[PDB]
Design a protein around this ligand. Structure first.
Ligand SMILES: COc1ccc(-c2nnc([C@H]3CCNC3)o2)cc1
Ligand SMILES: COc1ccc(-c2nnc([C@H]3CCNC3)o2)cc1
Length: 340
């Protein structure tokens, strides 16, 4: 690789390690914000649109219930999420602006991206043309190049976690399964449709699982549906381990060739995990029209710009029951969350 790429990644790792070793803590509190709307929910928390009362700036506030985190065995994963987010910096990652806790909850306050999830736009239009899919895929290739050089694995790539911003570019959100890993790791986690074979077979696995998930994402963007699906997870898993995939006839020959090498069931033969690493992907014929520097600099005109009226518009997100943010008069689970 060119020395300019090597020096860029060496500086990125230096800046990450300084924040990783000395994390920020307790940088706002709940009554500094007004609550506006619930943007989405989940197994042990939700994300709310909020407005800061002194500056007027909008944020996306992720709220996790401490007792429920403990019951669903997610303590280590929650601590991973906040420690990684306060230490990274890259054009296509959401920015964490504040974090804090109280007697009942943990809070992560991020810059708000009003354009909505990629999932909504893909399901609305049906599928993306190959140039449109390729513009998004290039941003994910550069983001994984960055995260993997910091010894991080992301482990939750899927369309609902890719937000579309005011310039039509991607910002990746939700680091709940991200982890710093020197060699191998073992936890069963992810969404069934995106899991690599070595996770399903309970092996020790590495960053090659993120390149498998990139193959599932590019197939889904260009076809409109993922390659492996069924009503029961055990049926999805049998299809993933089989080593067979079927492609629509409208796919280009170059796209089919790239996807056979990302959706390779033998992890020692998979693109992204060979001696040349990410450069086997960047140099593939499907990416021949891509200007990697121009994408990083945000100089390429996007395929589309989401429709929205202002920085507080919620029209690209959907409607959920509005529930209280209740804070107990007694402290819960203080010991488990000391480092947060
Ligand atoms: C950075 O600005 C945002 C905006 C919205 C969300 C968000 N909205 N919903 C979710 C989860 C629940 C349903 N899917 C994922 O995250 C995150 C950050
Ligand atoms: C009863 O058999 C098991 C199997 C797996 C696990 C397990 N899977 N993940 C974890 C956490 C420790 C490693 N980081 C997350 O424990 C625990 C008990």
């Amino acid at each position: 690789e060119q020395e300019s790429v090597k020096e860029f990644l060496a500086k990125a790792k230096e800046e990450f390690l300084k924040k990783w070793e000395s994390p920020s803590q307790n940088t706002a509190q709940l009554d500094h914000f007004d609550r506006i709307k619930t943007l989405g929910t989940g197994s042990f928390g939700r994300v709310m649109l909020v407005k800061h009362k002194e500056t007027g700036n909008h944020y996306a506030m992720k709220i996790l219930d401490k007792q429920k985190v403990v019951k669903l065995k997610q303590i280590e994963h929650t601590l991973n999420e906040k420690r990684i987010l306060q230490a990274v910096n890259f054009p296509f990652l959401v920015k964490l602006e504040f974090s804090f806790k109280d007697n009942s909850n943990l809070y992560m306050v991020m810059e708000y991206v009003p354009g909505g999830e990629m999932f909504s736009h893909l399901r609305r239009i049906g599928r993306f043309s190959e140039p449109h899919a390729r513009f998004y895929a290039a941003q994910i290739v550069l983001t994984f190049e960055y995260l993997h050089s910091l010894d991080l694995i992301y482990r939750d790539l899927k369309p609902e976690n890719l937000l579309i911003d005011q310039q039509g570019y991607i910002q990746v959100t939700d680091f709940g399964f991200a982890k710093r890993v020197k060699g191998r790791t073992w936890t069963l986690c992810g969404t069934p449709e995106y899991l690599a074979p070595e996770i399903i077979l309970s092996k020790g696995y590495n960053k090659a699982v993120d390149w498998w998930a990139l193959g599932v994402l590019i197939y889904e963007m260009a076809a409109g549906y993922p390659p492996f699906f069924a009503d029961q997870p055990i049926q999805i898993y049998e299809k993933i381990v089989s080593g067979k995939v079927r492609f629509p006839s409208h796919f280009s020959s170059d796209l089919k060739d790239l996807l056979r090498n990302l959706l390779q069931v033998d992890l020692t033969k998979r693109f992204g995990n060979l001696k040349n690493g990410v450069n086997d992907i960047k140099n593939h014929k499907w990416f021949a029209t891509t200007d990697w520097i121009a994408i990083y600099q945000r100089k390429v005109e996007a395929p589309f710009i989401p429709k929205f009226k202002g920085p507080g518009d919620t029209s690209n997100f959907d409607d959920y029951e509005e529930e209280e943010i209740r804070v107990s008069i007694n402290e819960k689970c203080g010991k488990e969350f000391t480092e947060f």
